Design a protein around this ligand. Sequence first.
Ligand SMILES: [Mg+2]
Ligand SMILES: [Zn+2]
Lengths: 148, 49, 82, 1337, 50, 81
Amino acid sequence: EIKELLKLGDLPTSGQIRLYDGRTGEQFERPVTVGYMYMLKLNHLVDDKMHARSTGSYSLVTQQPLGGKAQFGGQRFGEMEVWALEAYGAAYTLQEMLTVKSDDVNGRTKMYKNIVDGNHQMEPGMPESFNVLLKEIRSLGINIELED
Amino acid sequence: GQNMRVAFMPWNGYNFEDSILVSERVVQEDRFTTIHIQELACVSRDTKL
Amino acid sequence: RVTVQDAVEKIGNRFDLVLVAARRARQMQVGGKDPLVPEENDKTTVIALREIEEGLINNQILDVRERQEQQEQEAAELQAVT
Amino acid sequence: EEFDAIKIALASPDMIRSWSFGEVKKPETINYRTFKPERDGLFCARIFGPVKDYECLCGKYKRLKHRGVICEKCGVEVTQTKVRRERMGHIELASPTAHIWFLKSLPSRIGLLLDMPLRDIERVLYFESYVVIEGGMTNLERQQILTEEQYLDALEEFGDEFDAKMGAEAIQALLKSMDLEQECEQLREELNETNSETKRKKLTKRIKLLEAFVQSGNKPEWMILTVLPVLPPDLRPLVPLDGGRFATSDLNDLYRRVINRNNRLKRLLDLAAPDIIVRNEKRMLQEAVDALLDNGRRGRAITGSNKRPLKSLADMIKGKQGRFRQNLLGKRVDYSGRSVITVGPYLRLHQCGLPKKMALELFKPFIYGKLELRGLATTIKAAKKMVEREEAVVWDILDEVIREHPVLLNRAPTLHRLGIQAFEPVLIEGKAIQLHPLVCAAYNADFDGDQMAVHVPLTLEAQLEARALMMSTNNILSPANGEPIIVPSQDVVLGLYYMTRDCVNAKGEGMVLTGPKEAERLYRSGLASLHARVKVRITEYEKDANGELVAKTSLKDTTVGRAILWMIVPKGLPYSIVNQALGKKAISKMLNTCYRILGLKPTVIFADQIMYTGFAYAARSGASVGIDDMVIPEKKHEIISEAEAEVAEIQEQFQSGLVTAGERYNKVIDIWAAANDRVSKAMMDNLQTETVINRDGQEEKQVSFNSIYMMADSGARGSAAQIRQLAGMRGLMAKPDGSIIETPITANFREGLNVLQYFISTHGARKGLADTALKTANSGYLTRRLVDVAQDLVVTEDDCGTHEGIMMTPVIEGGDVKEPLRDRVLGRVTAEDVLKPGTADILVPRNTLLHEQWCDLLEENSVDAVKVRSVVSCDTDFGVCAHCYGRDLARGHIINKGEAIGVIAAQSIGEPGTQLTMRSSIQVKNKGSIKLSNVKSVVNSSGKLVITSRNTELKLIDEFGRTKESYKVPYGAVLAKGDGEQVAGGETVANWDPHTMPVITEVSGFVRFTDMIDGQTITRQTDELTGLSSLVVLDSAERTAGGKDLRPALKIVDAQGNDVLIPGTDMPAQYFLPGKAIVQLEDGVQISSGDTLARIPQTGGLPRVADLFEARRPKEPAILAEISGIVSFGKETKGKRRLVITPVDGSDPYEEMIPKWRQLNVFEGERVERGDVISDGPEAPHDILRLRGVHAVTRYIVNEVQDVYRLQGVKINDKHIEVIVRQMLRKATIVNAGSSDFLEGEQVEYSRVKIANRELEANGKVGATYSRDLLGITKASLATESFISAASFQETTRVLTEAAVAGKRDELRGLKENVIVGRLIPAGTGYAYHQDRMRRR
Amino acid sequence: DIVLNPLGVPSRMNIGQILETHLGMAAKGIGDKINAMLKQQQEVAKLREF
Amino acid sequence: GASPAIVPSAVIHQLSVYKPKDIVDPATPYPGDKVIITEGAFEGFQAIFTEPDGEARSMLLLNLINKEIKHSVKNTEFRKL
DNA sequence: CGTCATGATCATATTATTACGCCAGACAGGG
DNA sequence: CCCTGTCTGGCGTCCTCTCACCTATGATCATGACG
Ligand SMILES: [Mg+2]
Ligand SMILES: [Zn+2]
């Protein structure tokens, strides 16, 4: 029935028209399939997913950046990415990826001064969320410390 | 959605895995130009001072 | 710059390459030392690996030059004092 | 600051007072007139500090020359508000209170400290019993628990010096009056003197706790809280919801409940308690503290709103949504962004497209620095407003900061280590990330809406690590095998498959050409068709000279497309890599040979040029799929009608009563399988060779240029099955039972499908989707457990210095050789130096890495078994040496000193877990010599060779030394051949009965009955409808105790009445019988060999790999022989039947209760050896470890998991599974404590006891000997000498309580503790830093 | 207007989109013939016939 | 426990005439106590109680430096300790 | 001027179960 | 004390995006209106 309706119009029977090229202006071999397809635009647009953050706001209880897009936030450098950087020999990239860029507040203000002055260098320090872990374990009957 | 003239051919890699390659004739005709509306609220609260 | 293969051919560890090139780029960027190869407005990282590929920098030559240019500073201080 | 250890212990009440700056006394939080807090409630100011910096509550000090002085009005030290993040307060509990983590952690530390069960302690601690303290010279004991009437008795008769209390005061008096020295001496003396195994195990656990409690500095009464800490107020924040109210956090609710109940208890102890009354309030306080420390561990939890239980402290440390897995191991990160990916094929493979807006927002402070370094803004604020306005100069600044600065691209499910790569950005007008297509083979990323995230390396060392270690040109080999990961995926192999073929007559046929240059000039002008065979002249460079390229020239009979491709191939390769069809495997090994000949840089630029010309000629091809491309066979209808006539025949045979239901069902499914295969064969001929074209002579046929045939034959998308479903019938689908529908789907997708056929297709499809969902759910947790059991193993030396390695032989299931020697002994250092069978002639030295030339020289000489050094048999203390690992997979050379191989190994095993599944005789093929292994054979009367062993393994030795067939041979099987003989192909050489266990003999004599009394031992059951009856031998159950202790035996004798002995040994010849024997030949018949004395009646997926690495025991363990020698029976049926093994040189009295439901193997007169089986079934791994060795269990694990990964068609090299098996069997148990300080049943880690007896034995002492035990990976990871690793893994409560009472002291020991604490990993560059730091110690 | 990719058809077995494509081209062929018979200002008899 | 604690015939008789002390209580509003503020412009610090009103207000102890000015407030107005 | 009714504002924790599943190790039941 | 059943503890993928929801009811006190 599709063939008989393509025969009513003067279209080719097999549905395939030979098509020229726009750049070269010379014919594509082995004639190609054209027609009309009914295509839908979905509302997963690209200027609703795209996001970027240099330095925004920081969370209150653990001094790490906020999450999401409406809150101007940074992407979660999750656990499997930490495994994938342990799997290379990248050691300084992971150290700044979880001490300087993320958590340590004096470390990141030293970093921001050092970046706007041209000196690429990090003063590491300690994650502040590890001090939160010390306060939560210490708030039990447990006595966690840091020796030496 | 809308019905458009489609061809099945590999065209210079720009439709490699599942991608779609669209002429400017589609965007000139203003035919996928969807219209969105955002609601922005602003309340006048009651605080101190 | 695309590959760093010969920079590992001359420093076989591929982890000592990062230390030697970081030490070299820190000497070129903040310390204000001239590059030993003529650049093409490359950044200091690629100039460091480009000096590694010529062979004129590794950890041996960097320790030789830091000891000699520390002895030069202390020698200048001692000849200024006495 | 600087520190090398994190010590954990219990906390004395003086320690909690010395942390604390004040005391919380009231439960109010905020005033809610203002938000100035109430003194001195939870949120305070004079306990915890000022809300605002240098902003005193009263306000009186705010000068720069006036710092240090404290306030007088509110008494608030004008300092900083950061100090409200660190000051703690304390609550003085009015009555002591039992901590819940030491009461109900299973085991109970207060439980097996007091030598008292948990039910008595719970009935004392909740004020509903009485325990005794200071019992005095009365009838009552010390640990005797009482009740109300018994306390009335004890206070009437003994209201004097007798005493007893209840509640936490009584437990505190018990724990304080505990004398630890007396308990140590008494338990050591009892375990010297008692010696009962229940008491042995229980008392050695209690003395382990007491020695770990005495050696540390704890005290027992510190497990009962007197003073309770509060968390600082910034860490329990009070969020506003912008509605005038504070939906509080759960912690302030819990602390408020404890302070309410405690203040009411202070007031009730103040104004006097009504006798037996000051008890309910203390019960309420204990239950409120047990709600605060761990909510829900005690019976039913509390809630605020409405059903959900609210969050205690242990719910903030444990699990997901807690500080270990959500905030400390994976963090949210500044200088990062994310968008939707797209293709853009104009990129080189070390660069990616990235938007101008994202590149301007990620790289802000770089632009600020360049602005105030070039002098276009005075301060930082003018520069910020310039880059907010985006004026015309900052785009030049941005092109000057992007230029040589890598970024990290990341796909969101990172499975293996190629999921994070580093590129050099190119600015794009637009809002997507243009990503190079070949690279998307490693991300497993299509472009149907995938989203990738970019990160920026700030510091200088991170730019060098994202250039030298993580760049997209460096990672071209996978770390799972040696396969390249830059395989050209789909459009480009269609372009190359269309570019180089040949059709028999096209434009420009047979003309000769002066090189590939005018071949391109002929194709671009239309004077010659692209695939038309042509003689050309090529000049190829082969590197026969010593690193110098030799130019040879020739005239190849080839096509035009092959010449136009040949203008792109680099110099060193030969021509016969482009002189074929070039599908997907041909182009993949093309790139493989270009890598292993010319190195790296021509392989990168040649991958780029392959992608460019593949996209270009796939564009010029126009390989379009249509509806006339799927040729229906003309014989589909007649084959369907023949199969339907056959099911009509089986129908009208079924209703005549000749076939059953199951036989009918099997015949119907066999004829539909036959019809499906004939339809598939017909459509495959009508696709591949239908096109006929005249050669300018008469006619000729060729390979077809159909569109869907090239898309299925090149390897772009599809296979034989999917193009079979589009033209032939799509077969028999399954039903949700797992069964299979007898009426198949006789309709393909080119034709229609009616309603029922589409419904059955929906059964299959939704079963597949639910499999993929729950499959991913298990696969991710498998990767987690493997990277948390390995986690730590770093290549830390350069030569261990041992010899013992494992033996690599090619695996032989019993058909074709599945995995050859080249693909197993590729790149691993030899254990013993291989001598060719020209014995005393060395082929390889004993420390030679076996790369590809050496593997070819192994394949030529047909080397039997290259014994090779494995990771599991190493000798390096705290790590693995470099030579026992092998080649650095993903690279070419030996492994570098430092690369963390545990993590890459665990990712390489768990990464194909997404692909896995979830829910008579011996026939020879080849020809060669015949080998037998572990056989006890004898000669029958027929002249053949019959077998008297289950452990017989037949082998087919080929002409050059190795083995191509292996067959497990059953017990009593009959061979048509012998050992060392020669057979031919297709010759069945063995036959047996799988239903009957033959009891064939060795000597030739009469048969008599010994200990066979009729009526009891044997019963009279006449075979009714046949006639040949037998005296049926019964089991131990049916006959009573008059014959239960008498075993029926068949004694093979001679005519003299004696026993014809075994040839060689003077031992007699008699065969004892177990039950269920059907003895055919009765008393008085001469027998020979080969005659049965009696007749005897008789998950492979992702959970299988899980059950291997978890090391579960199976439900039916195949039991093995404990010790060698003869074997016999024991006590009769205490549920099970015993077994007594008596050796020749060993000792007899060992016994084991075998269940008689298992079919046994061994008789009374058979000798066993340790490591040999007693029955059959799946074989437990712990038995392999304790009975056969360590090499046996690592070999068994790698074979049993490689069968799964090769059944699903996945390549994983065996080093990774060997190193996971190294991190499994890491503990050990002591046998003789010796001159060290260990116990007799202690389970200490292996490297500790090996260095201990290495330093004992090196001097003139006697060391300590050991024995190894195998732990499953979750138990091997929870049993560490480092509590932070075992806390970041599963249950945190049990790990922290055990490490708390033990006083355990971590020293940061490897990777994950240093990821926690925020310092360098001791793997890559941080390994050199840690060698420097440890050398300066 | 739009150039798709053919290689998504034999693996991802949605062969219905190619029949939808051919029948859509048939529909537009009938529409083009109506547009040709109406742009030439033809009387209603030939339009009724077609 | 499942049932109420075995109450013997002793405490009941002992609680037949208790409260033989005085006001005592939880030390809140008395003659010489302490009480933090919660409302007004003179809040944020603490205060003391003495002779309050009764069915109207109380007695707040407001003082800065070395001077003090009493300001009758109802206890709802203040924050009873 | 006094009393009653209505309206507005401020103040605390049941209100009077059932549809996961496996493994594992301790606690205890039966003999 | 030696099994053998029961019990209750552990655990069950990653990343992102969107949306709502986050009391109301009862009692007491004060003010106004009507008698
Ligand atoms: Mg997809
Ligand atoms: Zn070793």
